[PDB]
Design a binder for this molecule. Structure first.
Ligand SMILES: Fc1ccc2[nH]c(CNc3nc(N4CCOCC4)nc4c3ncn4-c3ccc4ccccc4c3)nc2c1F
Ligand code: NA
Ligand code: NA
Lengths: 293, 293
């Protein structure tokens, strides 16, 4: 129970984000439902205001949620954001945990572009997973958004574009299921890692699971190591057996990138667009969830 | 002449037999409220209603836990007044001709795992997991599964330090044989794993209509329990669960594999069934079989 900024009513908690939990809220005068991220104001490692500045800078990008307000109330720093629709994990569930090839390809085009946009503004996301992509609402119902800059990092200097240096012995940031192999091996993340993670997300939608899910281990730290080991020991063409070759081509391209390379985002989009064309699918933007009755 | 305990509580019919005392429908005349009332004979050699009331009190505020009020002795009974709930899952199973649909089983499973997890989070094991001890709410709480009856419950870890109780052997079987874990039949101290194994048998009971170790007749309770034990031990999980989704066997195997002092992965177990629920095309609408009769 809180009122933020003389303007917003705080509603229920709906999930967690990076360094802050996510709540529904209401702009009381406008009657507009919003999403609200909260950070304990006494935290040793404050970052919500850093995140807010990244959002302000990213504003105007297609599929970046709008930031409505950032401030403080009571015991919290507060960031009020545009309300979006369900996540891609939610929609995957609503689609019986199967997506058509067409839907996978429609999603892939947008997800690559969203990652490219973030990179163009000098950041890497570092938390690419199905729960961080949400569909828009209303006139934006066909648009895939990416959320959460709480794990984002600047990878190149804004004035000179000098890339960050190569580093080793680093910690994993996001969900281990989708981490790149180099992230598991302790290498500093860069643009290639966001795109490799996306490749695992796409094959997760194709398969329903990844082969490194559900592994036994004594501890969380050891579980991550076993996930790493299974990823390293599963050839891409085994992972992607029976699916269009483009999914393997995509993953091998990402794994081939140098630390500081600029990815060829166009190439990666074109793989999937050419497959979409060869398959004869309609250019109607109809996703699988648009068929639900 | 109608029964009234103290001046305040009018007893109606018996609605269940609890582990150490029976539960009656009743009226709190002073409050003007329909309630449930548990009575324990004050001359019992092993008084425990007050103990049970304390466990309920400590559980208070948990989702799906009834509220209670301890009322001490009245004449030659100890009295505990309880929030009145709706029908038990056994009662509903009978109403539904002793078979539930897969969707209903999976709706129930999600909540039952969560109720057990909650009890474990408050440092107790239930030790009598059975359909008679899960009740639906009344009215607007009709979609909520509650758990009742702490008469056999035991603290399994220290509330502060989480030190677990020690392993013990040669324990008598005091709960319900039909749903007892294999280790319980073998005299082993119960722990969190046993509550979850029992729940696995409850789910397969709802799927099948009966378990293969029901109806085994014998002269004595020890002989009957031995026949049940032997049938459980000698029926492979994959035979028990033949013709049902693999998740039911995966669940039971997971529970049987846990160490005595292991913390179960309750999230994994809920996700196992939620993924199945979605693959089957069901919606979380809380429309149970008894709603569509
Ligand atoms: F009870 C529930 C359960 C799930 C629901 N999903 C939705 C769909 N809307 C949004 N959901 C989320 N969730 C993130 C945390 O896990 C839950 C989903 N973030 C949003 C949303 N709309 C905007 N954001 C949003 C916008 C900007 C962000 C910026 C940083 C971090 C998180 C951010 C989140 N409503 C739900 C609901 F009512
Ligand atoms: Na990544
Ligand atoms: Na219902």
């Amino acid at each position: 129970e809180l009122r933020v900024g003389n303007r917003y009513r705080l509603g229920r908690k709906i999930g967690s984000g990076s360094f802050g939990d996510i709540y529904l809220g209401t702009d009381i005068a406008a009657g507009e439902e919003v999403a609200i991220k909260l950070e304990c104001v006494k935290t040793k490692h404050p970052q919500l205001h850093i995140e807010s500045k990244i959002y302000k800078m990213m504003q105007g990008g297609v599929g970046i949620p709008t930031i409505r307000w950032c401030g403080a109330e009571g015991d919290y720093n507060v960031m009020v954001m545009e309300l979006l629709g369900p996540s891609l994990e939610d929609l995957f569930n609503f689609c019986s945990r199967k997506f058509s090839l067409k839907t996978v390809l429609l999603l892939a085009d947008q997800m690559i572009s969203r990652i490219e946009y973030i990179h163009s503004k000098n950041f890497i996301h570092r938390d690419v997973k199905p729960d961080n992509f949400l569909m828009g609402l209303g006139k934006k119902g066909n648009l895939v958004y990416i959320i959460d800059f709480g794990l984002a990092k600047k990878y190149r200097d804004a004035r000179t574009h000098q890339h960050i240096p190569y580093r080793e012995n680093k910690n994993l940031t996001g969900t281990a299921r989708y981490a790149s192999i180099n992230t598991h091996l302790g290498i500093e993340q860069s643009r290639r890692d966001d795109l490799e993670s996306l490749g695992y997300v796409l094959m997760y939608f194709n398969l329903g699971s990844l082969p490194w899910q559900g592994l036994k281990a004594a501890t969380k730290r050891q579980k991550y190591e076993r996930i790493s080991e299974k990823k390293m020991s599963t050839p891409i063409e085994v992972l992607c057996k029976g699916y269009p070759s483009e999914f393997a081509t995509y993953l091998n391209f990402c794994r081939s990138l140098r630390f500081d390379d600029k990815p060829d985002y166009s190439y990666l989009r074109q793989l999937f667009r050419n497959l979409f064309h060869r398959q004869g699918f309609s250019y109607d933007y109809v996703f699988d969830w648009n068929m639900l009755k």
